[PDB]
């Protein structure tokens, strides 16, 4: 149905995302159990890690477009990523390595992420009808890799240890690299302009030098979240000042702030909703016992099923508004499940969390899956940089918000933790409902501005 290079890119993306989500699914628990962090420290350190992972994406797009070539930067990114996963596995012998190892994942993701999508865009003549379907299948590729990793990585880590889990993340990257290398001939006439000139070793060293520097900076920021906060705060207020000094751009800005709220809520899945599943949900569904950390896989699960349906099936501000209403309902459902539908021992049915994740995934499909696609319709590279930047700010804020659910390690009674989760999730859901209402009210004004 699709060009041959589509299938190469599909599977490269699948395996790279498998490696990444293998880490994301187990990282907060790894911080708590393996490194002895409090739940509060674990949550904010996860926020900083994710913030760097997402905030650096603009660098790799620049590197791919203008320094080394899209295809070269795919190879380089995959290699730095694989190295990062094996370094994380090595952190079990050398615990002092962990932040450097995570910094290497962040910088690697920063180099890699923009470039397969760029490549995929170039696999189709410019007005090919198959393009939309191709990007929906690319999103599904991301979520199949995510579904497999989030399902299996906690089970593997429990049965064989973190070293094996992380080494398997590396192996997933190695298999992305092998499928690219084996299919390289399929993209011989596809790439950015530097891809077709011989590689500049000057620029390659500038990129390796800058990457190593960034790996150390990322490690430091993750160890000292209290200045990661200030860095992103001053960077944000500054880009706010320089955006405000400098009206179809106002629609992109307001859509960026609503997306920020969405990413704050997404950040709860690997942190507070993860520990809510651990502490106050039954770990058995349809008669099968499961690792409760695996419940995170319900996000890609619902995405994989719903993207075709919603691909088959107002306009700008209203789709965003709908997504925010869905997200509000996800957290109001979590709160209600804890408030009214818990056991005498404090445990709730996992069907409530299946529904929580349905709501959150629908919110995702309306807001972020379909965000920068028509942020490109209102606008460029600068707004791409700020988009990923504000997503980083959102992850830092999300870690901070998750800390309101942190439970001390000596608590053992689910009836003590349940009201904490229900209070915080109820307030998240009510605040997000208010945001969704203000969004609805601004929809007519926004929809005129787009005219």
């Amino acid at each position: 149905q699709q060009p041959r290079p589509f299938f190469m890119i599909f599977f490269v993306e699948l395996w790279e995302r498998f490696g990444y989500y293998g880490v994301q699914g187990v990282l907060a628990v790894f911080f708590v159990k393996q490194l002895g962090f409090s739940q509060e420290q674990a949550f904010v350190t996860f926020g900083a890690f994710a913030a760097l992972v997402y905030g650096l994406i603009s660098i790799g797009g620049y590197v791919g477009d203008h320094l080394l070539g899209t295809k070269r930067t795919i190879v380089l990114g995959a290699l730095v990523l694989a190295i990062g996963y094996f370094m994380t596995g090595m952190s079990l012998l050398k615990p002092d390595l962990i932040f450097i190892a995570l910094g290497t994942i962040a910088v690697g993701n920063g180099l890699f992420k923009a470039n397969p999508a760029s490549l995929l865009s170039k696999c189709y003549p410019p007005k090919d009808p198959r393009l939309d379907g191709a990007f929906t299948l690319f999103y599904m590729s991301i979520n199949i890799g995510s579904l497999i990793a989030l399902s299996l990585a906690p089970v593997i880590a429990d049965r064989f240890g973190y070293s094996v889990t992380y080494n398997l993340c590396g192996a997933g990257l190695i298999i992305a690299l092998l499928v690219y290398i084996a299919c390289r001939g399929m993209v011989k006439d596809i790439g950015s302009e530097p891809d077709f000139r011989p590689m500049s070793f000057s620029k390659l060293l500038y990129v390796l030098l800058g990457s190593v520097v960034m790996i150390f900076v990322c490690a430091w920021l993750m160890h000292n979240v209290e200045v990661a906060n200030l860095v992103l705060i001053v960077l944000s207020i500054v880009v706010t000042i320089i955006f405000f000094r400098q009206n179809k751009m106002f629609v992109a800005f307001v859509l960026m702030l609503e997306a920020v709220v969405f990413y704050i809520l997404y950040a709860q899945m690997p942190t507070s909703l993860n520990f809510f599943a651990i502490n106050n949900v039954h770990h058995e569904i349809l008669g099968f016992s499961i690792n409760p950390v695996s419940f995170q896989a319900l996000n890609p699960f619902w995405v994989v099923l719903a993207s075709p349906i919603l691909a088959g099936i107002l306009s700008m501000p209203m789709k965003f508004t709908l997504g925010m209403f869905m997200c509000s309902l996800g957290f109001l459902t979590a709160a209600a499940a804890g408030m009214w539908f818990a056991d005498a021992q404090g445990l709730t049915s996992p069907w409530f969390i299946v529904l929580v994740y349905l709501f959150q995934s629908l919110g995702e499909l309306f807001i972020s899956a379909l965000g920068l696609a028509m942020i490109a319709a209102l606008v460029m590279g600068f707004i791409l940089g700020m988009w990923f930047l504000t997503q980083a700010a959102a992850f830092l804020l999300g870690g901070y918000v998750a800390t309101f659910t942190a439970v001390p390690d000596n608590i053992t009674d689910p009836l003590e933790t349940l009201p904490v989760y229900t209070n915080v999730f109820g307030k998240i859901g009510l605040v997000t409902l208010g945001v969704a209402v203000v969004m609805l009210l601004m929809v007519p004004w926004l929809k005129r501005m787009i005219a």
């Epitope: 429990d158 651990i278 502490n279 000596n410 053992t412 009674d413 689910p414 933790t417």
Partner: nanobody, 122 residues
């Protein structure tokens, strides 16, 4: 996923016994282990437990006599039972739930040992 209990038996009032719980494939380190007991003609009841991070919970009538502890090197959980009394006679079970919580009812736990008879004679 499968727990083996060991160390039950027959003892006189005031005596002592140590139960141990070991797991097969998974590392018990990620699991809260609760000890339940079922006396003749009654339901399983929570007796004592330790979560994945050294939190402890106890039934009131065994405080000051029972101690739960964990050796994370040998991947083993122990119930040390001192000052035993006839009414501690029961089949004892270890049960395991992932994480930091020790719920009071058997349904909070997915993984179960087979049970060890403890008898305390007057």
């Amino acid at each position: 996923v499968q727990l083996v209990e060991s160390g039950g038996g027959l003892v006189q009032a005031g005596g002592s016994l140590r139960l141990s719980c070991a797991a097969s494939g998974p590392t018990l380190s990620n699991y809260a282990v609760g000890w339940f007991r079922q006396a003749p003609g009654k339901e399983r009841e929570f007796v004592a437990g330790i979560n994945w991070s050294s939190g402890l919970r106890y039934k009131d009538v065994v405080k000051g006599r029972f101690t739960v502890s964990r050796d994370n090197v040998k991947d083993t959980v122990y119930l040390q039972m001192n000052s035993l009394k006839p009414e501690d006679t029961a089949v004892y079970y270890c049960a395991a739930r992932f994480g930091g919580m020790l719920p009071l009812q058997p349904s909070g736990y997915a993984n179960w040992g087979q049970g060890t008879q403890v008898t305390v004679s007057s």
